[PDB]
Each structure stands twice: as structure tokens, then as C-alpha cells.
């Protein structure tokens, strides 16, 4: 390419389809694009797993006692009722408040 | 520069009156919500070299349930107030029967005067505020829920109801703006009412520590 | 935030034995009239009329900041050139260059300190748009101007004329903690942590976000999960 | 779309491009080019779908 | 009164909410089980609707006990679901829309 | 600017005041050599850095095989059709999409924007 070429072809735009095949310059640019996603896949896990473990170790002992209150291992009260309502999260549904609007 | 300072002084007085009303002291409805014009006309529109000198704005208020416990507020003229400038207020405080007062400083207070406030606490429970800190009623913000100061009998009933000791409650430090705005010591439970998107309303309690 | 650097064009120092000599051809100085050393600075009208300043304000700011160690001779807005000269009334002359760097770095002409760039746009999502209730009990979505910033100085912004002190949020939890309190932090933290999850379009039950925000705040201070 | 990008470049070269408020000359040039190319891709995709 | 409370709880216009059991679907299920035929005048007495909704709201308890603190907590912990339940099991709505027997 | 070395010992002259006459003089730190000033100016600082790149453009760049060349813009000096054009490199440039033209023909060396 000419120096200082800002056109679509000179900066990565691929005007061909996967049925019509790619020109060599477009092929290399497409490789450059796919490399970025392939790198992020490996990099992301080392952060997500660390965040996962760190989150769990802080809350691992919080449970619902027989008062229906939510306490940690040292009986400090976190929530008076689980979720502000005392209901399990796997039996609820999306609904509409008819009287609001 | 006088209109800005007058506006700044009017807002400080308005927030102070709102604070006194929320804290339980008796304040007339006229003073609770007065426009800038009444303030401008009352005290004279001249913050620098004029009639509305920072001496001349002291609110002496009295509690609702008897007119004996009374609170002053003081707006010192010096930017950085010191011990010599707070002993005058201490002399005024012992001269009267009043037991607590507020100081709204223009700049930060010297550490020596802060120690003086601390070490006289049991006799006179007086605290400080910053002028910049008092230009907005932070209780009006949408993030801050409703705060209520529980009474000792109510706290005893609550602990007996849930059968939990004092230290098992969630706690709030005495230095955060809301607790400071209400002026509450440690070992004083605070009710917090907030709207809950799951249940409707939710009531929580915070023990000052 | 606006330092003098933003609205200035260039600077130059001269050694001008008489204030009335006017080595530079400036009739504004001739009508306006002790150190022979002086500084000159030219501004540009673009950035000055954009921020709507006056030379009198600049002179007042200089006189206030540097406490009558120095004086300003400013050209009127009438002439095409935005000129002003600086002297020193009674470690000789390099001090003048030092204070020029100081006044350039740090003279706060307009705005407040911690805030670099401020944007402006009309919102599109209903949750940023103002919502009212009409006389017929409707919920019409109003469209009003909002400003997103690039710094954070929540207190000096809230305590300003015509800013709406009820809805102004900052995405910094620490600043909210220092200004609004622990419970405001619990709400703001839930909002921010819900935004980063629902931005993808995914849905997470509110019970878990609430529980996480509770364990991080139930001690009266921000307990970071580390 | 390619012709539209070319004439945008021509405007930018002749200083005929006015920067978007809140944006710089490079940023707005980049934004305009991306806008044209994204619109072209969306239109071509819709045509293929139909 | 419930309408006013909902408007202050939800400044955002959307009524989409998450609640314990799908009332509209239960109404539809009842219609199909008992062959309602919403073409004839209904048999349900409008006062039975009110006196049954009140009794049901008593039945659903999250915070146990009878002291004023417990009753206030129970009222707060079920407020939204009660609003929805009353706003859908109306006397007008039941008589005109669902035609339940 | 006019930064001027000492004639005798070849060193930078420093500005100085002759207080008796209040006159700017350039004096060596090492010998007593002194000179009278001709610019009253000592320190000049272009903060906006509105730099004219045409000073730094070299005609030899016209020999670059990788640069684009056009005939639509003719030279204003010699009227030659062929001219090579390129953009600025520095971030400090006041115009981002500023195009600089160098005459392609040998020894015209005309450079414009
Ligand atoms: Zn020499
Ligand atoms: Zn030529």
C-alpha cells in the first residue's frame, strides 16, 4: 500500500464473502482479527477464575438459619429475610403490575 | 463578590434549619422554608463589611418535648478556627444552661481545637461541620434512604424480639455523613427504611460503632 | 477545569527599562499609563469567547492568587489582539520565569479542579430520561439535558447553583462513601454491579446482587473482597 | 459505500471536515468512516437475508 | 392507596416485576378446568371475592408472630405481592374479565 | 532567539543586567567578555506549538518510491504537474489531515500545503 492510505481496503475492510474467498491482503488482515479473539480467550480465564474463587471465599459461610434470617458463621445478621422477601429464587416468575400504568 | 456569599450563607442556614427539624428540635414553619428574599431583607445583603456579619446568625433552638435542652450553632469569622476562638463559645456555653452546640467552620479546624472538642465531650457534647459539607441536605438525595433514630426502649424491644445480642446487628460508623448529620453517639441503633424492588419495603437496623 | 494554558497563544519575556518606553508598539499601554523586566503573553479569541471570560476577571484572579506581588496591564477586548503585560513592584529575573510556569500550570480560570472534560447530550434510554406524572396519571418520558464528566468532585458539583442535587450520581463508590454514607454506597454499588451484568442483556436474580452488596457493607465500612 | 468513504477522505484532505463537538478531527473522521462501512455491511446483510 | 405506593416504589415506568406464583396463568387454568364459558352471567357473588382475598392475605405469612414489630415486618415483607394479588383479584375485574364461578 | 557564543573562549553567553544603565548584556561566565543585546527577548515559549512543518520538509523526500504522487495540484512556482504529497508525523501538528506537497521535478524544491 501507498503511505497514508486510509481507504477501506488499506485498513482492513473485507469486501469479499467466505464463498468468494479472500484476497491475500484481506486474508492476512482476517488472521490479525481472529488472533485477537483467540488471545482474549486464554487471557480472560486467569482473571475470571481468580474473581470466582475470591468471591466465594468471602460468602461461603452465609446461610439461612431457622429464624428465616440470613447470618454468617459468627451469627452476625446480614439480612433479616433472604432476598428482602424470604422466598427462594427458583420458584418466582416474571409478571406485570396491572394497576401501575 | 457578595451575591454568591449571600446565596452560600442562605443555603447553609436552610440546611441547618432542616437539620434541626430532623434532629427533633422545634423550628417554626416560616424559618424552615424561607426564600432568599426574606434572608436578603432580614439580614441586609452585605456578607463582607456589613450587617450580616458571621457573629449575627446564631440559631438558638430548643427541643420539642421540653424547652430546657437547647442547641446553639456558631459560624466563626476566622477561616481556620482555633482554641482561643472556641473558648469564647465554651464561655458562652457555661454562661448559659445549654449543653450542646454546633460549629460550622469555613476552613478545616486545627487539630488542637479538635482535641479540645473531644476531651470536654461528657460535659458538652458539641460537634463541628464544614461550610462546604453543609451546602446540600444529603438526606434529600435519591440514594440515601430514610433514617430514624431508635429509642432505648425500642432497641430493647427489638433485641428481645429477634433474640440477638447488641453486636450481632449490622453496624454503621459514627463518622459517616448521615450519622454525623443526625448527631448520634455509639451504642445507638438506627432504623433504615428503604424501598425494595423484591418485597415492597424493607426495614434494617444499624448499630452505631 | 480551565487553566490559562488552554486560552493562551504564546509568551515572551523582555527587558524594557522604562514602562512608558513601550519597546513593543502598543498604544493601549500608552493610554493606560517598579521593574524594567516584564513579561508579555498573547491569548487567542477562539478559546476565550468559547469560555466567555473577561480580561478583568483574569487580572482579578492573578491579583488574588499572587497577592499583589505583581500587576497586570491588559488590552481592551476592542483590539484584535488579546495582550496583557506583567511587572513586579518592589533571584532577580529567573523567578519571573518560575512564576510564569507556576501560573500557567495551576491558575484556575473557570470550573473546578479534578474535572478535565465535560460532555453534553440528550439521553435516549428512559432510565436516564426524566420521568414525571401528568394530571391524568400518565408517565410521559421527558427529554432534558444531562452532562457526563470525566473527573469526579461530587461535593463541589452538588453544592452549585442550578445543578439538580437529588439525582446526580458518580460511578466511584469511594466518593459516594465519603459524601453520602454507607447506605447510599449499598444502593449505588448495587446499581453499578447490576449495570455491568445487564449490559450484556443477561439477567441475574436480584437476590444475589443484594446479598453480595450486603456482605460488602454490613460492617459500616467498605469491605473490599480481597 | 466505497465511493462515500473516498469523498469523505477528499473532504478531510481539503480541511472541509468540521469536527464533531466533543470529538477531535481524527476521531470524527474515524467515526464517519466506521459509520459508512457499518451501514454498508448491514444493508448487504439485509439484502442477502431477503 | 396501593397504586400510590407502587408509583413511589417504581419511578421507572415499566411494571415488569418478579413475583412468587403466576396469577394470570392460575386464572386461565381455573377457567379451563371448570369450563367457565365467559358468555353467560357469572355466579360468583362480588363480596365473596373481597372476603376471600382478605382471608388469603392473612394465610400468607413470611414473618411469624403477633407483636406490632412482627406484624409490621410481615406487612412489609409481602407488600408487593399483596398489591399484585389485590390488583388482579378485583371484584370488577373478576366479574367482567375472568368470569370465574 | 539569537543564542550567541563567547568570541574568545567559545562558551554560551548568559544574559545579565547592567544595573547602573539598566541595559541587557550577554556576558561569559569564564572571561569578562561582554556584548550589548539586540533582542530584548531572552525566553520565548510557544505553548500551542503552532509549528510550520514546511520548514522541516526536505525536497529529497521526492525520491521516495513509496509515496503517492499526483498531477491535479500543480506547482505555483514552475507550474510543473507532478508533485508528491504526504501527511504530518508529529502529534503536535495543528491540523491532523494536513497534506504537504513537494514538487517532483529536480531543483524546484517548492514545498507548500
Ligand atoms: Zn568567554
Ligand atoms: Zn515546481
Amino acid at each position: 500500500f501507498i503511505k497514508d492510505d486510509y481507504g477501506p481496503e488499506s485498513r482492513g475492510f473485507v469486501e469479499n464473502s467466505y464463498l468468494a474467498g479472500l484476497t491475500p491482503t484481506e486474508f492476512f488482515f482476517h488472521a490479525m482479527g481472529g488472533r485477537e479473539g483467540l488471545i482474549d480467550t486464554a487471557v480472560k480465564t486467569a482473571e475470571t477464575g481468580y474473581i470466582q474463587r475470591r468471591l466465594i471465599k468471602s460468602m461461603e459461610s452465609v446461610m439461612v438459619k431457622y429464624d428465616a434470617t440470613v447470618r454468617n458463621s459468627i451469627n452476625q445478621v446480614v439480612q433479616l429475610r433472604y432476598g428482602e422477601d424470604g422466598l427462594a429464587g427458583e420458584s418466582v416468575e416474571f409478571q406485570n403490575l396491572a394497576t401501575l400504568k | 463578590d457578595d451575591e454568591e456569599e449571600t446565596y452560600r450563607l442562605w443555603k447553609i442556614r436552610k440546611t441547618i434549619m432542616q437539620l434541626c427539624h430532623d434532629r427533633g428540635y422545634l423550628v417554626t414553619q416560616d424559618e424552615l422554608d424561607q426564600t432568599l428574599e426574606e434572608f436578603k431583607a432580614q439580614s441586609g445583603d452585605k456578607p463582607s463589611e456589613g450587617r450580616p456579619r458571621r457573629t449575627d446568625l446564631t440559631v438558638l433552638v430548643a427541643h420539642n418535648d421540653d424547652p430546657t435542652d437547647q442547641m446553639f450553632v456558631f459560624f466563626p469569622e476566622e477561616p481556620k478556627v482555633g482554641i482561643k476562638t472556641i473558648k469564647v463559645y465554651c464561655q458562652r456555653m457555661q454562661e448559659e444552661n445549654i449543653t450542646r452546640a454546633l460549629i460550622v467552620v469555613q476552613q478545616g479546624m486545627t487539630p488542637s481545637a479538635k482535641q479540645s472538642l473531644v476531651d470536654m465531650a461528657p460535659k458538652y457534647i458539641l460537634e463541628q461541620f464544614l461550610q462546604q459539607e453543609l451546602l446540600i441536605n444529603i438526606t434529600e438525595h435519591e440514594l440515601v434512604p430514610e433514617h430514624v433514630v431508635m429509642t432505648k426502649e425500642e432497641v430493647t424491644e427489638l433485641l428481645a424480639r429477634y433474640k440477638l445480642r447488641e453486636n450481632q446487628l449490622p453496624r454503621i460508623q459514627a463518622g459517616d455523613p448521615v450519622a454525623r448529620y443526625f448527631g448520634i453517639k455509639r451504642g445507638q441503633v438506627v432504623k433504615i427504611i428503604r424501598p425494595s424492588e423484591t418485597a415492597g419495603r424493607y426495614i434494617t437496623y444499624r448499630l452505631v460503632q | 477545569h480551565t487553566t490559562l494554558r488552554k486560552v493562551t497563544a504564546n509568551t515572551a519575556i523582555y527587558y524594557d527599562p522604562n514602562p512608558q518606553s513601550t519597546v513593543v508598539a502598543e498604544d493601549q499601554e500608552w493610554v493606560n499609563v517598579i521593574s524594567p523586566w516584564l513579561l508579555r503573553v498573547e491569548l487567542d479569541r477562539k478559546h476565550m469567547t468559547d469560555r466567555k471570560l473577561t480580561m478583568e476577571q483574569i487580572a482579578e484572579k492573578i491579583n488574588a492568587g499572587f497577592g499583589d506581588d505583581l500587576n497586570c496591564i491588559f488590552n481592551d477586548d476592542n483590539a484584535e489582539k488579546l495582550v496583557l503585560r506583567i511587572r513586579i513592584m518592589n533571584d532577580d529575573d529567573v523567578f519571573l520565569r518560575c512564576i510564569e510556569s507556576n501560573m500557567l500550570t495551576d491558575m484556575t480560570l473557570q470550573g473546578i479542579e479534578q474535572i478535565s472534560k465535560v460532555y453534553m447530550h440528550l439521553p435516549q434510554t428512559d432510565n436516564k430520561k426524566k420521568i414525571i406524572i401528568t394530571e391524568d396519571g400518565e408517565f410521559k418520558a421527558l427529554q432534558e439535558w444531562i452532562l457526563e464528566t470525566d473527573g469526579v468532585s461530587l461535593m463541589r458539583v452538588l453544592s452549585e447553583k442550578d445543578v439538580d442535587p437529588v439525582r446526580t450520581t458518580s460511578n466511584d463508590i469511594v466518593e459516594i462513601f465519603t459524601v453520602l454514607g454507607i447506605e447510599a454506597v449499598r444502593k449505588a454499588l448495587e446499581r453499578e454491579l447490576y449495570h455491568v451484568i445487564s449490559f450484556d442483556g443477561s439477567y441475574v436474580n436480584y437476590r444475589h446482587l443484594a446479598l453480595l452488596c450486603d456482605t460488602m457493607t454490613c460492617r459500616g465500612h467498605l469491605m473490599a473482597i480481597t | 459505500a466505497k465511493q462515500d468513504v473516498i469523498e469523505v477522505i477528499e473532504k478531510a484532505h481539503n480541511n472541509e471536515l468540521e469536527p464533531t463537538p466533543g470529538n477531535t478531527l481524527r476521531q470524527t473522521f474515524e467515526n464517519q468512516v466506521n459509520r459508512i462501512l457499518n451501514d454498508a455491511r448491514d444493508k448487504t446483510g439485509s439484502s442477502a437475508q431477503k | 392507596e396501593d397504586r400510590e405506593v407502587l408509583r413511589v416504589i417504581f419511578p421507572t415506568g415499566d411494571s415488569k416485576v418478579v413475583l412468587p406464583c403466576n396469577l394470570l396463568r392460575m386464572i386461565w387454568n381455573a377457567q379451563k378446568i371448570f369450563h367457565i364459558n365467559p358468555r353467560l352471567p357469572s355466579d360468583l357473588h362480588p363480596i365473596k371475592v373481597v372476603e376471600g382475598v382478605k382471608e388469603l392475605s392473612k394465610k400468607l405469612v413470611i414473618v411469624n408472630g403477633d407483636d406490632p414489630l412482627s406484624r409490621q415486618a410481615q406487612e412489609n415483607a409481602t407488600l408487593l405481592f399483596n398489591i399484585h394479588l389485590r390488583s388482579t383479584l378485583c371484584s370488577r375485574r373478576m366479574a367482567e374479565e375472568f368470569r370465574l364461578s | 532567539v539569537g543564542i550567541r557564543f563567547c568570541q574568545e573562549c567559545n562558551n554560551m553567553l548568559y544574559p545579565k543586567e547592567d544595573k547602573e544603565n539598566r541595559i541587557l548584556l550577554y556576558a561569559c561566565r569564564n572571561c569578562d567578555y561582554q556584548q550589548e543585546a539586540d533582542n530584548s527577548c531572552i525566553y520565548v515559549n510557544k505553548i500551542t506549538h503552532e509549528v510550520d512543518e514546511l520548514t522541516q520538509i526536505i525536497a529529497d523526500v521526492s525520491q521516495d518510491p513509496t509515496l503517492p504522487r499526483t498531477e491535479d495540484h500543480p506547482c505555483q512556482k514552475c507550474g510543473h504537474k507532478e508533485a508528491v504529497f504526504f501527511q504530518s508525523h508529529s502529534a503536535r501538528a495543528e491540523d491532523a489531515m494536513r497534506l504537504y506537497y513537494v514538487c517532483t521535478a529536480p531543483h524546484c524544491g517548492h514545498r507548500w500545503t
Side-chain angles (χ1 to χ4, degrees):
Chain A
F1 297 136
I2 282 301
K3 280 195 183 295
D4 294 332
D5 194 3
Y6 285 128
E9 298 164 349
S10 166
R11 290 300 300 269
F13 188 68
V14 178
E15 70 253 17
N16 289 308
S17 71
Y18 290 125
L19 188 292
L22 313 188
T23 68
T25 293
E26 295 163 356
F27 178 86
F28 193 67
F29 291 163
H30 188 54
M32 255 191 269
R35 174 58 62 78
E36 187 184 6
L38 207 54
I39 288 164
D40 287 338
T41 293
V43 159
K44 176 171 65 177
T45 54
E47 286 291 333
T48 59
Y50 187 39
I51 281 175
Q52 176 91 223
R53 176 177 182 270
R54 202 165 48 189
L55 270 175
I56 287 142
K57 277 300 178 181
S58 68
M59 298 197 292
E60 64 166 355
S61 60
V62 172
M63 62 181 326
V64 162
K65 301 293 191 177
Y66 271 102
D67 307 328
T69 187
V70 170
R71 315 205 198 189
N72 51 11
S73 60
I74 56 182
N75 278 332
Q76 291 182 350
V77 152
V78 188
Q79 288 173 353
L80 291 170
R81 302 285 123 163
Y82 169 42
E84 312 180 306
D85 68 357
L87 300 143
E90 59 100 20
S91 294
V92 291
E93 291 183 66
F94 280 98
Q95 319 216 27
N96 281 305
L97 302 162
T99 171
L100 175 56
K101 290 176 66 183
Chain B
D1 194 7
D2 284 331
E3 195 276 333
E4 284 298 326
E5 189 166 3
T6 308
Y7 173 74
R8 198 164 59 235
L9 261 65
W10 165 64
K11 282 206 71 62
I12 292 154
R13 188 179 179 88
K14 189 172 176 66
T15 316
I16 277 295
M17 299 322 293
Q18 291 178 356
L19 192 170
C20 294
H21 176 71
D22 282 331
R23 199 178 283 204
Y25 288 74
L26 190 139
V27 48
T28 174
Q29 181 62 253
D30 194 4
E31 287 176 348
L32 192 54
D33 72 351
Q34 73 172 356
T35 74
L36 191 140
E37 298 304 321
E38 283 95 4
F39 181 93
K40 183 180 282 177
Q42 279 161 20
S43 310
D45 201 22
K46 200 64 178 173
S48 303
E49 298 96 27
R51 288 180 172 189
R53 192 183 184 190
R54 314 194 81 161
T55 48
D56 200 22
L57 303 97
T58 48
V59 200
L60 171 60
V61 291
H63 215 295
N64 257 346
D65 61 17
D66 67 317
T68 60
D69 42 349
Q70 297 168 9
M71 171 175 328
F72 283 131
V73 310
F74 296 117
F75 308 164
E77 303 94 319
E78 303 85 4
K80 185 162 185 179
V81 78
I83 289 183
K84 266 82 176 176
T85 41
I86 69 154
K87 289 307 291 181
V88 182
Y89 298 124
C90 171
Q91 193 268 332
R92 297 216 31 200
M93 283 195 77
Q94 62 94 30
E95 182 70 27
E96 307 292 323
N97 64 304
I98 62 109
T99 58
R100 58 214 296 191
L102 256 62
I103 293 98
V104 176
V105 295
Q106 190 162 2
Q107 298 299 321
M109 181 156 57
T110 173
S112 64
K114 296 176 69 65
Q115 295 300 322
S116 300
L117 296 187
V118 171
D119 69 30
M120 74 195 300
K123 184 189 294 294
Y124 296 153
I125 45 190
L126 83 171
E127 69 261 20
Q128 74 134 347
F129 276 98
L130 263 73
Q131 161 158 19
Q132 182 65 254
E133 170 176 28
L134 262 190
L135 281 166
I136 48 154
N137 189 359
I138 52 105
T139 320
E140 306 295 327
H141 205 275
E142 79 170 358
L143 286 167
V144 184
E146 182 190 5
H147 284 83
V148 173
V149 180
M150 286 204 108
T151 63
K152 296 153 142 292
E153 190 265 328
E154 281 172 348
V155 180
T156 301
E157 180 186 0
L158 158 72
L159 300 177
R161 158 69 192 92
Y162 286 111
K163 296 194 288 186
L164 48 89
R165 290 175 297 172
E166 184 62 275
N167 56 356
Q168 291 183 358
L169 287 175
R171 59 185 53 199
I172 171 182
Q173 69 183 7
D176 71 333
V178 174
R180 186 161 63 211
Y181 169 83
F182 282 181
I184 52 181
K185 315 174 268 78
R186 55 179 295 158
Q188 202 170 5
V189 165
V190 172
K191 264 182 62 178
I192 283 153
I193 305 108
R194 64 194 179 193
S196 162
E197 89 180 15
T198 294
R201 209 176 296 108
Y202 191 54
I203 318 298
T204 195
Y205 314 98
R206 292 291 182 92
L207 163 64
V208 182
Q209 277 288 323
Chain C
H1 192 253
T2 292
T3 43
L4 191 40
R5 296 173 74 259
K6 304 296 291 296
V7 297
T8 187
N10 47 12
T11 84
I13 323 182
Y14 307 92
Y15 186 68
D16 185 46
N18 214 0
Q20 86 91 33
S21 57
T22 59
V23 55
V24 180
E26 287 294 321
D27 63 357
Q28 55 98 28
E29 207 286 331
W30 301 340
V31 75
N32 213 341
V33 70
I34 302 169
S35 170
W37 287 114
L38 90 176
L39 186 143
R40 193 199 73 156
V41 47
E42 302 275 346
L43 292 88
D44 57 8
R45 58 184 56 259
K46 177 59 187 294
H47 311 104
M48 200 294 295
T49 197
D50 281 331
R51 290 167 177 80
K52 278 87 72 177
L53 303 116
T54 70
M55 302 301 101
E56 298 85 3
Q57 286 163 352
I58 305 166
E60 179 75 29
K61 295 297 284 184
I62 298 154
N63 204 3
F66 294 103
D68 204 10
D69 290 348
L70 88 177
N71 58 359
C72 179
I73 298 301
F74 54 90
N75 197 352
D76 305 336
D77 294 345
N78 299 320
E80 65 171 357
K81 295 277 106 176
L82 275 292
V83 202
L84 70 97
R85 301 183 184 179
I86 297 168
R87 306 264 185 172
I88 317 95
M89 314 80 69
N90 293 315
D91 54 348
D92 184 10
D93 70 305
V94 65
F95 178 72
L96 171 140
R97 189 178 55 79
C98 181
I99 70 164
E100 169 195 357
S101 295
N102 199 358
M103 71 103 57
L104 277 178
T105 44
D106 297 352
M107 277 280 294
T108 66
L109 276 299
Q110 283 297 323
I112 63 175
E113 303 197 31
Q114 302 85 9
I115 184 173
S116 61
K117 177 67 69 179
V118 188
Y119 300 91
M120 167 163 169
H121 68 97
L122 287 171
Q124 298 303 320
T125 70
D126 53 353
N127 82 309
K128 290 202 293 195
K129 292 179 78 170
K130 184 175 179 65
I131 309 292
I132 62 169
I133 289 172
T134 66
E135 301 296 325
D136 52 342
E138 300 300 321
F139 266 132
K140 71 184 292 181
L142 290 180
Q143 191 177 187
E144 73 171 5
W145 286 108
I146 74 168
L147 310 95
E148 296 181 352
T149 72
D150 213 6
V152 57
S153 194
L154 179 62
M155 197 162 63
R156 203 162 170 84
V157 169
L158 283 182
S159 65
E160 268 207 356
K161 190 177 289 180
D162 220 15
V163 164
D164 177 2
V166 177
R167 309 126 84 193
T168 308
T169 304
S170 62
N171 76 342
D172 185 2
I173 298 174
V174 182
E175 193 65 45
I176 285 165
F177 187 49
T178 56
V179 172
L180 290 181
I182 179 64
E183 279 296 329
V185 163
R186 200 291 199 171
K187 191 65 177 176
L189 164 63
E190 165 199 336
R191 286 169 67 173
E192 295 297 330
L193 174 130
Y194 169 79
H195 180 76
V196 307
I197 286 171
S198 75
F199 185 81
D200 313 337
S202 64
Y203 166 72
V204 167
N205 203 348
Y206 167 81
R207 294 175 181 70
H208 317 296
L209 323 183
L211 191 85
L212 174 64
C213 298
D214 272 328
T215 66
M216 287 175 38
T217 59
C218 74
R219 296 297 91 195
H221 57 88
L222 277 173
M223 181 255 268
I225 300 177
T226 49
Chain D
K2 194 144 56 182
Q3 184 55 251
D4 295 342
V5 170
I6 289 165
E7 66 177 23
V8 165
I9 291 171
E10 283 189 356
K11 286 192 291 184
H13 279 169
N14 292 321
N15 295 310
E16 299 175 354
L17 208 150
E18 281 86 7
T20 294
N23 281 315
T24 323
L25 181 57
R26 184 88 66 188
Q27 262 80 17
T28 184
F29 174 86
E30 176 74 17
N31 291 317
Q32 199 158 356
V33 169
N34 282 295
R35 197 188 315 296
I36 300 175
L37 297 179
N38 289 313
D39 292 335
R41 178 181 48 75
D42 286 335
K43 193 174 188 293
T44 50
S46 70
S47 173
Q49 290 292 136
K50 287 181 182 178
Chain E
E1 292 170 353
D2 291 340
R3 187 166 180 268
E4 183 57 41
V5 168
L6 287 185
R7 282 177 175 268
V8 86
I9 281 176
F10 288 104
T12 60
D14 199 12
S15 66
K16 200 175 183 182
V17 82
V18 188
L19 282 184
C21 59
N22 194 319
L23 288 169
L24 293 177
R25 182 160 50 63
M26 299 203 224
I27 290 161
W28 190 2
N29 287 306
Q31 286 173 353
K32 290 284 151 175
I33 290 166
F34 294 108
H35 318 101
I36 278 297
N37 183 2
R39 189 60 58 173
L40 312 180
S42 175
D43 167 68
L44 183 63
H45 189 40
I47 211 63
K48 278 180 91 285
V49 170
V50 187
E51 84 181 6
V53 160
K54 294 172 81 72
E55 178 179 358
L56 188 65
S57 177
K58 294 285 182 65
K59 254 70 171 302
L60 309 176
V61 52
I62 287 293
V63 186
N64 204 346
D66 199 35
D67 50 88
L69 201 62
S70 297
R71 279 188 290 106
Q72 183 56 248
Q74 162 64 38
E75 197 261 338
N76 278 325
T78 57
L79 170 62
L80 195 55
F81 179 71
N82 275 317
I83 286 180
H84 184 251
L85 186 69
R86 285 194 298 272
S87 173
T88 186
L89 259 70
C90 320
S91 54
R92 171 79 163 274
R93 205 191 175 102
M94 191 75 38
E96 287 188 356
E97 290 196 4
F98 311 127
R99 299 286 179 95
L100 283 183
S101 67
Chain F
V1 174
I3 186 162
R4 279 177 275 113
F5 299 100
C6 171
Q7 205 43 67
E8 143 192 332
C9 187
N10 284 321
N11 288 97
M12 287 189 174
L13 301 170
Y14 294 101
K16 194 181 177 181
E17 285 204 67
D18 184 36
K19 305 172 187 176
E20 295 81 344
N21 294 323
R22 301 185 182 278
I23 290 177
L24 176 60
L25 306 172
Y26 278 91
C28 186
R29 62 167 183 151
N30 205 275
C31 61
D32 217 293
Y33 181 73
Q34 293 181 359
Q35 283 194 140
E36 77 282 14
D38 301 333
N39 291 308
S40 195
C41 195
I42 293 171
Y43 184 81
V44 63
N45 194 357
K46 288 189 178 180
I47 173 147
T48 189
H49 208 279
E50 177 171 29
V51 53
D52 181 72
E53 296 287 328
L54 292 174
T55 58
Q56 299 173 356
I57 302 301
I58 312 168
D60 297 333
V61 187
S62 71
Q63 292 176 353
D64 197 354
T66 58
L67 281 178
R69 47 185 53 81
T70 41
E71 301 179 355
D72 53 4
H73 303 289
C75 176
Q76 315 76 27
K77 278 190 172 182
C78 72
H80 185 70
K81 48 175 57 70
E82 262 280 354
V84 81
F85 68 96
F86 56 95
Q87 296 170 9
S88 59
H89 284 43
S90 53
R92 287 82 183 278
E94 290 280 42
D95 285 312
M97 307 304 174
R98 202 57 152 139
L99 265 185
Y100 296 93
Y101 304 167
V102 177
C103 188
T104 302
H107 313 112
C108 177
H110 192 56
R111 292 159 281 138
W112 65 101
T113 318

